Amino acid sequence: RREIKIEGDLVLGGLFPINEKGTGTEECGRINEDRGIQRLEAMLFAIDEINKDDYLLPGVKLGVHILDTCSRDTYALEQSLEFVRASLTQENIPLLIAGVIGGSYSSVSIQVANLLRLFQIPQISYASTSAKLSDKSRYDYFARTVPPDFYQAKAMAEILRFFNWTYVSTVASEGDYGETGIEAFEQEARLRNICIATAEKVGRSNIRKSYDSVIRELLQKPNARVVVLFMRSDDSRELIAAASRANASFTWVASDGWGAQESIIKGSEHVAYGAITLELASQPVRQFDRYFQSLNPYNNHRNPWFRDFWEQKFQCSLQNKRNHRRVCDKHLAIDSSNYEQESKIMFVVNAVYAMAHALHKMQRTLCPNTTKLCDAMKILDGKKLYKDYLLKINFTAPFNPNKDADSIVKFDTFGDGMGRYNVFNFQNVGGKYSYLKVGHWAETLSLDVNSIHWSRNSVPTSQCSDPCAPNEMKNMQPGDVCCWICIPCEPYEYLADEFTCMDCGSGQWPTADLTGCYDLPEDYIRWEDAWAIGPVTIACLGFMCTCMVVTVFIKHNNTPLVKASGRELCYILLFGVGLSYCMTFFFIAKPSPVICALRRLGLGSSFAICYSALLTKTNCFISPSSQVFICLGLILVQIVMVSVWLILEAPGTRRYTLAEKRETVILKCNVKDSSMLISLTYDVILVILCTVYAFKTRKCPENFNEAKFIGFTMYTTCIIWLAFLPIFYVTSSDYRVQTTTMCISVSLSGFVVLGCLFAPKVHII
Amino acid sequence: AKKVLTLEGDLVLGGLFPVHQKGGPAEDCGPVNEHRGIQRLEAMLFALDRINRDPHLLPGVRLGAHILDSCSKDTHALEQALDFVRASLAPTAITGVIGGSYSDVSIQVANLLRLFQIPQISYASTSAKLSDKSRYDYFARTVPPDFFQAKAMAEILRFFNWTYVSTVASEGDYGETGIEAFELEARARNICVATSEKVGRAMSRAAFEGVVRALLQKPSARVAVLFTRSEDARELLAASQRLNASFTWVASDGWGALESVVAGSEGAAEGAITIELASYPISDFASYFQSLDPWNNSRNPWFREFWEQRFRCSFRQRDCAAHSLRAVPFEQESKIMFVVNAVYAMAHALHNMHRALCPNTTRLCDAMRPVNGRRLYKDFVLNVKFDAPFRPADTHNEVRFDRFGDGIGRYNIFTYLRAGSGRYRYQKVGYWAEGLTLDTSLIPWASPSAGPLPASRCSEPCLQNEVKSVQPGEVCCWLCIPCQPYEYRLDEFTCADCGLGYWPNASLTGCFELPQEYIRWGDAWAVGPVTIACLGALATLFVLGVFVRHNATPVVKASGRELCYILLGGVFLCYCMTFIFIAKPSTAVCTLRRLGLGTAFSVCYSALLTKTNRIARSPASQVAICLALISGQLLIVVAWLVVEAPGTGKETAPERREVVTLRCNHRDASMLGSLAYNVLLIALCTLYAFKTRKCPENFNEAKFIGFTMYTTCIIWLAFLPIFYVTSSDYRVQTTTMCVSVSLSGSVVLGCLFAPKLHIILF
Ligand SMILES: N[C@](CC1c2ccccc2Oc2ccccc21)(C(=O)O)[C@H]1C[C@@H]1C(=O)O
């Protein structure tokens, strides 16, 4: 095999994927020029700078022990045993390894970290972004200068929140990358006010026919216009091309895998327009540019893989021993024309400097007097180096003196680097398609909206999320898990819950959304109304007129001594007229808690008193007195069952109306309307029958006037009964029927008293 | 300074035993273990030799051996385990290791060998953290884990209904995980822990006395669950003996049946229920080990050190000649069975793999040269149900691995009992193999006596009468306190304050109302009210005939006739309110009753006013004044009753005081004031009549009227003191109210009207 074993006071391990993984007889095949060779030289370049440095380990020389992992996890374990041979108590003397600057693959790093933790060897990774490595329970001597993969999920969620993109669709890929990150996105999404619409998986081993179905199932949701892509570089390229065939137009939010790469947009720049992509914020290392270009096989003997890299890159053989390859020219060299710096070069340099800084701090504390290696450094405990010194480093980037404020190299509690991501945007400048940085995410969100076009428009995706005009909108919808397009409720129904609008109170008006749970108010009849003042004055005038008759009757009751019983008949008739007149005083009052209970008793008593007086007159010293006593007893008997009707429920049970807006009800008297009219009608039918018989008979001895008066009043009772019942039977108005009966009652009272008092009026005048 | 036992064969089985004890800082490892390392290593060698000579187990394949020494340290075990991997990458490749006696050693070896696909079968590691497959993909063990004994103890406690127990833990690794396991199992079996505490190795006798006193803080916790080491248990027993405290200890495998724990502490250890791992001695292994000497044993490199340490001699001299293992007693290690079972399980898995890969040949298979831990482990190591080798006859023991790759939990229940002669011994009284079986006839305290140490609870369940919701600070203590009769409970958590009068009919839900109260007495006290009503009815009949001949009588004719009629009606009204008061009060009866006496005082007051008018001095004016006074008296009556809303339903004393709904909700305070105002006016009118000197005229009527008024005023002034004196007994108040109005009615008939009728009649 091949390895680098440069000697020094302290030796740092190294794991790089110089050779690409292969199949068959060859375990690893082609040389990785970018991720294997350029990263390998970055570690060597940094260590050479550290050795030449006067402030970082001036008396300690840093050696190397670098092995090729061949991009295989199993093959990395076999060479990982060489790092622990020197830790166990003469062809090849083992070298003590202070730390391992290796990784570049999550599978390689995971396997290596499992072996290194058993021997307390600190490990710093430069390209491993697996979220599994953040678990300190299984990897308690592992650190990385790059942020973990799930940090991108937090970055993508903030972009959605900034643009108010709530109803989003997530697309993942099979393996270990897609599931892990897309899983961590949901908790970050649910932490904010965002719910996932569709979850999808994309496989490597499938045909473009399945890719079309991935696109098609995304179109059967018109609202979802933004698609959170957490796919891989090759997987995302086919899906975007699939959308072109299906004529789709979506806004793509993508993580690492689709950053500023120009190999995905190819041939499908139309649908990819307006996409937002993330990429690691890596700056070029200017000093590394001259180091790599000035490397030649004739003077770079430290790297044993440089001969293979030179032959593979230029397709030439240095020693053409009858081979089918051209002889490499002596003047061949690499320049900026065909040299592009690898993206994670600055992370390799930072990882090397991180270990050197930790060792330098540990050396000073253990050896303050001297600047050389001590006997206390011979044991070289890895638990103290990692937990106490490596995790507590704080220094600026050695080769980035322009932005030292935000380029500090440090490790958090879980031994992970700071998350600084760049936000790009695929846009059309006009005749050219290219990416453009439109912000950055370093512990906070910062975007340049003015330079973002085709996404400057809000492009709402909240047709489900929250249209929710403040008409007590309810967040729910059948069939859809979290669409909740706010339709399933109405402004009349108060908002009390999310899944159900939960109307509280029938026919109730909410105040803003919930507080209107109280029942709607109602208005009763208005007191002292214009339509009530008239009858009140009429009743007062009628009562005053009857009172004047009473005063005249008693004054003129002396000379006519013949009519001994006439005064008694006049007195009871006057009392009945006064009682009937006084009925209107309280009947028209709107508040009737128990007033209506006495109203029916008063109306019945007034009718009974009038009927008793009429019956006594029709029938007609000791004998008249007995008739008055019998008539008085009949009136009392007529009131015996009057209170029986109110002996069950005088205030009533309840009062309602067909209209649910006015609700013009008494709300205090709920007696039976049918029973009230039936009793009133039955109280006048017998009066008319008894008066008709008296009219037919002839009363010669001075009783003709009484007989004529009885017959005249008979028609008035029939007319009033035949008119009061029909209006209140069907209409049942709050006040219109009440005032009509009041006018009829006072008119009837005035009519009956006029006939009885007609004869005294003529005699007096 | 390392030795290795390397046998040769087609398949090599690794081994890891604690041959040497921990050395410390002075040396890597010092003294040689005589039972944990040497005996188990010899057991593995004997099992391998038996397998190699078994025609029914790998007839062609010969099993090798590569046994190393871990020196009872995890770092040394990790360093030594880097010999199997080098062979996998003249080292001989292995198919799996059979080793690991300590939990840390096994954990480190499993962590190292998992990455290289090397299955590992342990024989003594009972760590509870080795069962999860998230970190140990190729680990198996024949011994059960340490959380099985926790649920075994939980089931033991449940069987004896020992809900209230106290647990004692240990500071080390063994002493915690078992405690959380037992706590988790106890909650699923309705078992509560009273006190939880930790005991450390460095604790002195003062700490043990303190923890014993803390255990004694709960008198109701007579059962102690000990999950500790042997030394901690021995120290706790010694501390309990010194303080002379009695407990029913329940212990795990840490105590077991060891006599060193009860060494000198037999008095306080009586009645303890300890559990130990179940195993049986192997006669074949004992015979093989007894016939072992350094001269004829060259395979074992550590045998010379073991011989030197056990038999105290040396090989530089010639003293190590006569000594032999046969003469000296030999004690077989309890876990030799597990080592043999692990070796045989590995051999059976290898045989099954060889048979499955190619049944054509019995020799090592062509395709079996590459050995993979994944397939072998998952497909054959887990699925073994072979018969236990060297097993006794009357027993059914199988070697199987569950889906966590652990052994089968089989424990023996042991008790510490005193014999008739006084000897103390541990005797098995049951076993736990996926089920608890105790005879409950050999335990010394299981005999019928005054309670077999009942550790029921902090308090007895109390649900028959009292409410058991009150707790003193612990949710498990379950005690009751009775509530007062006023506080009938309607729920299991509190006593409702509905009242004792509304006793539910054996329901205790909703506080069903009791209609029984003082509403109306049909015959208890209505007899007296009937007499007053009967007297009033007779007076009304007499009044009807009194005024029939009033016109004929000149004396009655001279007096006012209109006022005479209301006088009879006023007396008739006196008994009209009598039966209303007796009747059941309601929202309408009391209001009618309230108006009954309101107009009763109006007619009598008007009678006095009209009487004074005749003395001072007409019928038209007299009837006008009385009508106005009656209207005026009734004017304030209607206004007063609407001030307070009347209703039904009154509260009274608890315990069925029978005073519920005695009177309606209308307040009677205003009624007393209304009648008092008119009483003074009536009295003043009577006094004014006596002032006039018109004695010669109408002397007979004036004297009767004055006497009647004087009696009424005297009687009225006497009712007021007795109303406030009682202030209760509504039935008595109703009774004295009926007699009060009747007395006024009785004297009303005895007024000046009575002599007028007597003269006319006579
Ligand atoms: N940083 C990576 C990220 C890697 C990855 C990146 C994009 C797409 C798929 C994908 O596969 C997974 C799966 C799980 C974890 C990490 C990854 C690493 O290996 O950790 C890798 C780029 C680094 C390098 O090889 O230089």
Ligand SMILES: N[C@](CC1c2ccccc2Oc2ccccc21)(C(=O)O)[C@H]1C[C@@H]1C(=O)O
């Ligand atoms: N079986 C044991 C159990 C062991 C143990 C047993 C009793 C008291 C203390 C104690 O220390 C711990 C701590 C944690 C886990 C297991 C134990 C093992 O090592 O797993 C160990 C007896 C086996 C042997 O060393 O031969």
Ligand SMILES: *[C@@H]1O[C@H](CO)[C@@H](O)[C@H](O)[C@H]1NC(C)=O
């Ligand atoms: C997102 O909505 C908030 C208010 O809900 C608003 O202030 C902000 O400007 C919006 N961002 C956009 C439209 O990009």
Ligand SMILES: *[C@@H]1O[C@H](CO)[C@@H](O)[C@H](O)[C@H]1NC(C)=O
């Ligand atoms: C435990 O209680 C059960 C009833 O729940 C009883 O049958 C059993 O005998 C009790 N165990 C004893 C008393 O040891």
